[PDB]
């Protein structure tokens, strides 16, 4: 998918995007 998916995977702040809000 777009860099958006890989981000939430690689985002220590937004990879937590699923748990925390950013």
Swiss-Prot record:
Transmembrane segments: none
Region (Disordered) residue spans: 1-22
Subcellular location field: Plastid, Chloroplast
Record PTM: Contains two disulfide bonds; only the oxidized protein, with two disulfide bonds, is active in complex formation. The C-terminal disulfide is involved in the interaction with GAPDH and the N-terminal disulfide mediates the binding of PRK with this binary complex.
Domain of life: Eukaryota
Record's compositionally biased regions (Basic and acidic residues): 1-22
Tissues where the protein occurs: Mostly expressed in cotyledons, leaves and flower stalks, and, to a lower extent, in flowers and stems. Barely detectable in roots and siliques.
Cysteine pairs bridged by disulfides in the record: 8-17
Regulation: induction: Induced by light. Repressed by darkness, cold, anaerobic treatment, heat and sucrose. Changes conformation depending on redox conditions.
Summary of subunit composition and partner proteins: Monomer. Component of a complex that contains two dimers of PRK, two tetramers of GAPDH and CP12. CP12 associates with GAPDH, causing its conformation to change. This GAPDH/CP12 complex binds PRK to form a half-complex (one unit). This unit probably dimerizes due partially to interactions between the enzymes of each unit.
Record-stated family: Belongs to the CP12 family.
Miscellaneous field: Binds copper and nickel ions. Copper ions catalyze the oxidation of reduced thiol groups and thus promote formation of the disulfide bonds required for linker activity.
Its biological purpose: Acts as a linker essential in the assembly of a core complex of PRK/GAPDH. Coordinates the reversible inactivation of chloroplast enzymes GAPDH and PRK during darkness in photosynthetic tissues.
Protein's recorded name: Calvin cycle protein CP12-2, chloroplastic
